[PDB]
Design a protein around this ligand. Sequence first.
Ligand SMILES: [Br-]
Ligand SMILES: [Br-]
Ligand SMILES: [Br-]
Ligand SMILES: [Br-]
Ligand SMILES: [Br-]
Ligand SMILES: [Br-]
Ligand SMILES: [Br-]
Ligand SMILES: [Br-]
Ligand SMILES: [Br-]
Ligand SMILES: [Br-]
Ligand SMILES: [Br-]
Ligand SMILES: [Br-]
Lengths: 313, 316
Amino acid sequence: SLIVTVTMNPSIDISYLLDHLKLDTVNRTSQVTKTPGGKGLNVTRVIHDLGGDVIATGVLGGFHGAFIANELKKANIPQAFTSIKEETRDSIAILHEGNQTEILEAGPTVSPEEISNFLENFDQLIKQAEIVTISGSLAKGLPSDFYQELVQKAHAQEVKVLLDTSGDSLRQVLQGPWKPYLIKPNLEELEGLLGQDFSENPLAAVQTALTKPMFAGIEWIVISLGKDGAIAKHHDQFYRVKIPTIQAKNPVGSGDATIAGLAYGLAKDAPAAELLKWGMAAGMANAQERMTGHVDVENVKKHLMNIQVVEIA
Amino acid sequence: SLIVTVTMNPSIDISYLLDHLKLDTVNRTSQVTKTPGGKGLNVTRVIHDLGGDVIATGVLGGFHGAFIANELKKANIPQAFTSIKEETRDSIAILHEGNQTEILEAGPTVSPEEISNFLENFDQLIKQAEIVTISGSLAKGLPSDFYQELVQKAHAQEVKVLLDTSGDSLRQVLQGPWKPYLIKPNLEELEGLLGQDFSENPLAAVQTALTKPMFAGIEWIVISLGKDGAIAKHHDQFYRVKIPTIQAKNPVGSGDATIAGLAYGLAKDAPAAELLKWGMAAGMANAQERMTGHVDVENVKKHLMNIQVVEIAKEG
Ligand SMILES: [Br-]
Ligand SMILES: [Br-]
Ligand SMILES: [Br-]
Ligand SMILES: [Br-]
Ligand SMILES: [Br-]
Ligand SMILES: [Br-]
Ligand SMILES: [Br-]
Ligand SMILES: [Br-]
Ligand SMILES: [Br-]
Ligand SMILES: [Br-]
Ligand SMILES: [Br-]
Ligand SMILES: [Br-]
């Protein structure tokens, strides 16, 4: 069943491997990777790797956008981005001595007319979809509540929204009458929403938090806890998800991978326990890969066997 | 008269102003510029700013190369790059707390077929030029003596080459039979070649060094001393060029600007003293700009009036 991903501020992700980062001087390297990035494209790639039926949308501009579209084509990832005039952004990640120093650009400005063009395209794509993922930053020009329009449209088409987003904005979706099917805030995200501190006995705190009016009407809530696995709520059932303590190279985007695994599970009508395993197993496989937004499916399937899902009273 | 610039490893110069650079953490900015870059493209933009008749060549690949081609079109800078399959590189300059941390990519590999294709295009181009500038780094795949072949091709059309390169790529030209019209090594570059150090006050030593066999056949030699001006040699005439002190906003590329000034002076048949002044004044105007490869032509013309060209006596 068709999953649509949304990436409103896609990036050429540039990754530099450096022995040492010498400040105020020239650092040379031939250890460079340039990859389609932004959270929604990390998601897209993982779903694609899992064998899911995905199409990527969002906005792409200029030669940078054309580079991304061509990379997606070479990978045989179905895409249906909307064109904009301004250039798609670059993101820089510098890897040096265990450090990850990053530079994020604000990105291009999208015009009201381009926003209208994207929404028309979004309307057509979601007619054929079962699931939509919405995550990541908004390009400039987009109204701070852009994602709520997207949730409302999916609702009219009876499409399940996986919303992996944060802050004041996520709060405004949750405040409104059109609920996402699934949300996946991390602990700091959740602390931000509730204006609450969960540093002491986080597991017990999260279980209380998820009973709050904030979260009413959301079918699935999945809170990743890193090595502690997850706490989740489906309607009135709380779950604890316990995962093996694995050797975890690059954690960047294991959260985009979790969402991909969750979308993939939903797409195949996985029961609750299985759905939570696809999520955790994808996040796990991703962390064992240098490439962000990439898993090997055989290793995912392996991790599925060693995750425990526990119903909490 | 037409000046052809050569950039064998062009880049998108990406510059970020951050008030703080924070290691092992995400740094956000909307202060970003992406510009056609590589030493030859710095040269090109300054020549174009000065009002010179310029055309840029080199190699451009993929979507990053197409981006460079497009920015030049928007600038109305004529171009005649040849295509390669691999993507044109990016360069990163992070500006933070006075500093300039940079990351340079090795860049694309040019194939033997692609080199041939460049050289065919170059031959035609150079039939239309009076002057060619050759600067900067070679892309992977090019042999270390590549610039020598470009000098040889220029000579076949009586085109004057200004060569601003270092290390082996310079030394192989200097050891060989095809001599550029002008070279512009800085003191340190001069030391490396010779394997000497220079004292405080290096004029006597430079004078002696430039009469050595490896510099024979080169009509102009310009040794930049940065803030302290230049020492130059035109055939058997030595010169000291004294320049006004300035408040340098950003010195980066000011040797590229100097080469642009020298090329512009040559193209207008400037006599020796005027030629040297154009070079110095462009270098100075560039240092006064935050943007790399850019000059205010009115700063340049003001500087021309405050530079002293001093002829030095020989030997006896
Ligand atoms: Br590289
Ligand atoms: Br890809
Ligand atoms: Br993003
Ligand atoms: Br939101
Ligand atoms: Br609440
Ligand atoms: Br930006
Ligand atoms: Br260069
Ligand atoms: Br330009
Ligand atoms: Br150089
Ligand atoms: Br040699
Ligand atoms: Br004298
Ligand atoms: Br004399």
